[PDB]
């Protein structure tokens with residue numbers, strides 16, 4: 284046995300075909316876990332994440348499921364178990380970002396965001412509890428903007444992750460009857476497609492800076508003068524879902540390099 | 544003739560104000576001098592009583608029916624409030640439902656039942672308030688002590704529903720600043736209403752085997768003050784937040800539990 288390792292464990296990561304999810308999947312594979320890789324759209328990217336987990340000497344499978352659909356989350360979890368035999372770790376990572384002044388937010392934009400970020404995560408957790416083995420791990424995904432960072436025109440997304448914060452604290456109470464811990468990672472600005480999507484909204488007059496200048500300014504948010512990377516979030520998920528991480532339970536961990 | 548804390552000339556709207564916390568708020572704002580729009584979805588008779596209560600103490604009020612789950616009915620409610628009284632200054636989002644269940648048992652339908660009102664509803668109330676309200680207005684949403692300060696088994700859905708409200712109001716205050724509107728939430732603990740008696744047993748270790756009175760007595764011991772929370776206690780705080788003097792409290796969630804936390 285090796286401390287911090289996941290030899291003989293089976294894990295599932297939602298939206299692990301790219302971004303943070305991809306780094307989490309690969310890292311769980313590096314730690315010894317067999318991995319179910321979930322995507323909605325990024326097939327080739329998911330097959331590529333599968334390849335890397337195998338390349339490290341583990342096993343992985345790619346399963347297409349749209350996390351907005353609860354019948355699909357159920358089917359995803361059923362198929363995970365039927366393939367690997369059991370499931371120990373579930374990481375809810377899939378999410379979308381949004382910007383808009385309160386006055387312009389539509390019914391459709393609200394639903395687009397909450398169906399995935401909140402409702403989706405809520406039922407990934409449900410299916411995880413239902414399918415997991417005794418002593419398992421569930422990790423959901425929040426945001427530094429949930430509680431720790433206040434950005435104009437960012438109310439919908441912030442709120443969607445605020446629910447997740449309350450969710451995991453109470454989930455830990457219910458999930459304890461199967462000795463399962465429930466936590467959330469709350470990343471700050473982490474360099475992925477999402478970062479490039481909305482970095483201009485996190486900076487005063489963001490439009491008047493290049494993409495690279497915005498990345499450099501984001502790097503100075505942290506007193507460590509660097510950006511957050513998907514590996515940083517992976518590193519923490521790795522510890523949370525290890526035997527050693529058990530006493531962290533029902534907590535939300537903000538991962539912004541000390542920006543807050 | 545300006546008295547600090549009063550709301551003469553002001554027009555207020557409280558969702559779900561036919562009964563419960565919202566009725567006390569609506570009545571209270573009326574006592575402070577505001578003209579009030581009393582909202583209901585089902586309690587017609589009780590809404591009429593609130594209207595009458597507000598008229599008997601020297602103010603004016605109207606009862607408007609609107610399901611707060613329906614966004615086009617929120618739009619209409621706000622359109623009618625401004626239409627009837629001339630302008631709108633204060634909006635209190637109060638309408639909510641409680642829910643209990645172990646995570647493993649929570650259905651899509653129950654999820655949607657709770658979130659469409661407690662969260663989505665409150666979100667779009669806030670939106671219609673910003674669109675209709677006057678410069679220097681006030682917006683109060685309703686969170687809960689369970690969102691963040693109190694942790695109860697089998698209570699994840701409801702807790703999260705209000706945890707969303709907590710982040711909403713903080714950011715709302717940023718957007719709403721350009722109309723000089725303040726946005727806050729009140730997060731009550733155990734407050735004696737229909738909702739309270741309906742679920743007090745889910746908050747106490749096998750509260751099934753205590754009476755309804757006994758459970759209220761036990762909730763009273765949560766506060767170091769040794770009494771329950773009442774709708775008037777929330778009304779008292781909302782009353783300050785929406786006054787002139789409460790302006791510097793902005794983008795905040797005020798837990799109102801008599802110091803239980």
Ligand SMILES: NC(=O)c1ccc[n+]([C@@H]2O[C@H](COP(=O)([O-])OP(=O)(O)OC[C@H]3O[C@@H](n4cnc5c(N)ncnc54)[C@H](OP(=O)(O)O)[C@@H]3O)[C@@H](O)[C@H]2O)c1
Pocket residue numbers: 297298299300301302303304321322323324325326348349350351376377378379380399424425426427469470471472473474475476477478
């Ligand atoms: N990046 C940041 O700075 C940052 C900061 C705070 C919080 N977060 C949170 O971190 C999580 C991941 O963010 P990211 O940076 O990896 O974003 P990203 O690079 O845009 O990736 C989003 C991921 O979500 C998946 N996804 C989207 N819709 C889905 C659906 N309907 N069903 C299943 N999966 C779906 C995507 O998969 P497909 O491409 O296959 O659709 C993709 O794998 C999100 O919850 C985000 O809110 C990110």
Ligand SMILES: NC(=O)c1ccc[n+]([C@@H]2O[C@H](COP(=O)([O-])OP(=O)(O)OC[C@H]3O[C@@H](n4cnc5c(N)ncnc54)[C@H](OP(=O)(O)O)[C@@H]3O)[C@@H](O)[C@H]2O)c1
Pocket residue numbers: 558559560561562563564565582583584585586587609610611612637638639640641660685686687688730731732733734735736737738739
């Ligand atoms: N009581 C507590 O200990 C406590 C604690 C924490 C938070 N809260 C929150 O405080 C708020 C009020 O609580 P309460 O104790 O007064 O609840 P309550 O006694 O059950 O009253 C519910 C109120 O919401 C209205 N309502 C319900 N569904 C509605 C809808 N679809 N559209 C518009 N209005 C609707 C009801 O009016 P109709 O009868 O006409 O439907 C009624 O006026 C809620 O947000 C609740 O979550 C209460």
Ligand SMILES: O=c1oc2cc(O)ccc2c2oc3cc(O)ccc3c12
Pocket residue numbers: 380427432471472473477478481482485486497500501502504
């Ligand atoms: O904290 C953040 O959270 C984010 C979350 C996202 O999903 C995307 C981008 C960011 C992001 O860009 C920034 C730029 C800055 O100069 C300072 C902070 C941030 C910041």
Ligand SMILES: O=c1oc2cc(O)ccc2c2oc3cc(O)ccc3c12
Pocket residue numbers: 641688693732733734738739740742743746747758761762763765
């Ligand atoms: O904090 C509370 O919030 C509530 C909210 C409701 O809607 C109904 C009941 C309660 C309630 O009952 C209790 C009994 C106790 O012994 C201690 C705390 C509470 C408590």
